Amino acid sequence: IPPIPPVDFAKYGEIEEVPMTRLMQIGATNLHRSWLNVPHVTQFESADITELEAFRVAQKAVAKKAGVKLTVLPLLLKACAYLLKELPDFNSSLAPSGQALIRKKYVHIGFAVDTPDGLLVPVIRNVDQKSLLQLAAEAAELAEKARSKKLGADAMQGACFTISSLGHIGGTAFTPIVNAPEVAILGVSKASMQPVWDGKAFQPRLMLPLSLSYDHRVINGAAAARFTKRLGDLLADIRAILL
Amino acid sequence: IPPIPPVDFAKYGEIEEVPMTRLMQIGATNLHRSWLNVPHVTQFESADITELEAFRVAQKAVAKKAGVKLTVLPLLLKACAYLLKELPDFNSSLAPSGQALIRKKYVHIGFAVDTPDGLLVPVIRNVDQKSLLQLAAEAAELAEKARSKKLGADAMQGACFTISSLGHIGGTAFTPIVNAPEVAILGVSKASMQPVWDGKAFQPRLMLPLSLSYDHRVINGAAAARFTKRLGDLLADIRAILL
Numbered sequence: 504i505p506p507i508p509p510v511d512f513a514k515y516g517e518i519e520e521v522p523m524t525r526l527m528q529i530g531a532t533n534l535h536r537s538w539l540n541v542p543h544v545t546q547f548e549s550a551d552i553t554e555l556e557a558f559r560v561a562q563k564a565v566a567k568k569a570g571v572k573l574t575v576l577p578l579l580l581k582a583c584a585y586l587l588k589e590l591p592d593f594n595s596s597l598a599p600s601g602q603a604l605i606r607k608k609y610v611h612i613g614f615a616v617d618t619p620d621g622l623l624v625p626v627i628r629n630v631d632q633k634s635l636l637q638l639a640a641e642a643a644e645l646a647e648k649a650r651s652k653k654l655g656a657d658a659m660q661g662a663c664f665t666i667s668s669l670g671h672i673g674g675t676a677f678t679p680i681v682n683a684p685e686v687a688i689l690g691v692s693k694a695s696m697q698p699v700w701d702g703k704a705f706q707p708r709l710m711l712p713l714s715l716s717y718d719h720r721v722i723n724g725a726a727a728a729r730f731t732k733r734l735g736d737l738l739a740d741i742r743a744i745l746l
Numbered sequence: 747i748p749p750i751p752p753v754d755f756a757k758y759g760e761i762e763e764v765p766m767t768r769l770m771q772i773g774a775t776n777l778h779r780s781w782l783n784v785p786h787v788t789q790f791e792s793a794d795i796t797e798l799e800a801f802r803v804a805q806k807a808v809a810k811k812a813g814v815k816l817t818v819l820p821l822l823l824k825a826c827a828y829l830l831k832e833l834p835d836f837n838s839s840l841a842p843s844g845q846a847l848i849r850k851k852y853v854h855i856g857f858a859v860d861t862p863d864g865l866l867v868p869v870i871r872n873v874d875q876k877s878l879l880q881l882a883a884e885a886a887e888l889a890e891k892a893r894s895k896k897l898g899a900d901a902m903q904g905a906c907f908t909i910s911s912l913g914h915i916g917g918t919a920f921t922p923i924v925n926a927p928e929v930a931i932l933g934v935s936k937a938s939m940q941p942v943w944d945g946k947a948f949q950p951r952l953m954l955p956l957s958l959s960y961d962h963r964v965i966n967g968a969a970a971a972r973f974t975k976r977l978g979d980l981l982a983d984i985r986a987i988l989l
């Protein structure tokens with residue numbers, strides 16, 4: 504690939520060199536390797552989380568009594584786990600022959616924690632088997648270890664799918680990069696109150712923005728529009744996971 | 747126990763003798779054995795199932811596509827299974843020494859099917875592990891076999907707890923008899939629309955009547971009022987099973 508020509512930047516004013524951490528350098532190499540290997544598409548969708556949110560908020564005491572804080576991440580993790588089993592092509596990886604998919608029968612999901620040294624993506628194993636307060640506790644443990652440089656490489660391995668949430672900061676949508684060899688990543692941005700047509704008038708509904716990027720060699724446009732459709736439906740009534 | 751004196755019933759008019767099936771005779775002996783062994787109390791409670799009902803009704807297509815019909819029995823079975831694990835004294839039996847309880851670590855639940863030959867109580871094993879449509883299908887299979895005299899004694903064994911539902915016929919509450927050696931049985935009667943105080947005015951809420959009878963040697967009044975309280979809370983928001 505052609506390199507970028509170097510520029511004498513000091514010709515235009517004062518410059519200062521600061522170095523990158525090794526974590527950043529690893530980060531950079533992996534993103535660029537994903538970028539060039541994966542033909543990326545992003546499918547955008549909005550989910551109605553008005554009731555999910557009122558559930559989250561009422562279980563605040565139960566959560567506090569358990570010493571965990573119930574955020575949105577466990578509710579996303581649980582729904583994505585159910586879905587990674589309903590639609591197994593999203594839970595798989597392209598075999599190195601390029602002629603086979605390796606379907607995984609396990610669901611482990613990573614989540615992006617941006618730390619000062621750089622990006623870490625801790626993995627929660629068997630997300631399909633744990634409960635909202637278990638996932639709540641573990642997510643928080645893993646993120647604290649990640650921030651404290653005390654996360655062991657053991658916990659950064661063999662994820663199936665990644666959730667990347669920037670909802671705590673802002674934004675409307677973004678296009679995340681697939682964390683190859685995984686085949687998809689869900690970006691989540693900030694929920695807003697929004698007018699939604701009910702057949703007669705517009706009703707304010709709390710809308711969550713989802714941005715699914717996927718590896719188009721393995722997932723086609725319709726499979727991906729179906730994944731964000733189902734996910735928006737599960738987040739609108741999470742009781743459907745019960746059936 | 748003193749017997750009832752025989753009466754010449756034909757002295758008062760015409761009589762006819764019809765005989766009881768062996769099933770009825772077994773039924774009769776067991777009820778009387780339970781009656782005399784178990785000091786019975788019944789704890790009554792009403793659960794607000796307005797939203798559970800609207801869930802049930804919306805999943806009608808999913809259920810039809812799966813070939814099952816989603817009634818209320820699976821939603822009761824799932825909630826009682828969660829509860830039989832939260833409050834383990836309800837999932838146990840009095841040891842024959844009378845000085846120990848045997849706590850069971852498995853949840854299998856029976857349910858009363860009244861058939862022409864008499865009462866049968868088929869058992870669904872590991873209710874805690876199956877899903878609403880799995881329990882829906884199995885419940886219906888078992889009840890058809892029960893009606894058809896094709897249920898094998900295998901499926902009438904080792905239940906932990908019994909649900910007895912007469913909601914399909916009518917009534918306000920009743921006092922069921924504990925199916926000993928189990929320690930409790932939930933009777934369910936007919937749901938009605940009811941005014942419920944919201945702090946300001948009365949709101950119509952669809953109320954389900956529950957009648958828990960229990961073996962008072964093993965369960966005390968407060969443990970039982972706590973079981974129907976929790977069950978009414980889980981049926982009001984079944985998503986709490988998720989956490």
Ligand SMILES: CC(C)(COP(=O)(O)OP(=O)(O)OC[C@H]1O[C@@H](n2cnc3c(N)ncnc32)[C@H](O)[C@@H]1OP(=O)(O)O)[C@@H](O)C(=O)NCCC(=O)NCCS
Nearest residue numbers: 574575576614615616642643646667668670671692693694
């Ligand atoms: C469990 C944990 C790992 C992730 O939590 P989270 O789901 O991001 O939620 P947080 O509590 O961090 O979010 C901060 C606030 O923004 C809110 N927020 C989160 N997602 C939101 C969304 N998508 N839309 C709008 N607001 C959102 C939170 O609910 C929270 O509100 P509060 O301060 O009133 O409680 C958390 O303990 C943690 O470490 N948080 C730090 C932020 C982070 O790195 N998140 C990465 C998730 S991929």
Ligand SMILES: CC(C)(COP(=O)(O)OP(=O)(O)OC[C@H]1O[C@@H](n2cnc3c(N)ncnc32)[C@H](O)[C@@H]1OP(=O)(O)O)[C@@H](O)C(=O)NCCC(=O)NCCS
Nearest residue numbers: 817818819857858859885886889910911913914935936937
């Ligand atoms: C799954 C099965 C075993 C039990 O079903 P169920 O939960 O009793 O529900 P049913 O569909 O039989 O009930 C008949 C109707 O009364 C309704 N009903 C049931 N419980 C009710 C309640 N507690 N309050 C008010 N109405 C109720 C049902 O929802 C159903 O309505 P529909 O005809 O409009 O669909 C069912 O297939 C069956 O065999 N039913 C026959 C009745 C029976 O023996 N039930 C025993 C349960 S312990």
Ligand SMILES: NC(=O)CCCC[C@@H](S)CCS
Nearest residue numbers: 530533615624679680681682
């Ligand atoms: N884990 C890594 O070392 C590479 C960076 C992560 C890939 C995704 S999270 C990029 C999101 S935009």
Ligand SMILES: NC(=O)CCCC[C@@H](S)CCS
Nearest residue numbers: 773776858867922923924925
């Ligand atoms: N199973 C039996 O043979 C005995 C009868 C059942 C006990 C309960 S269901 C009575 C309910 S009122």
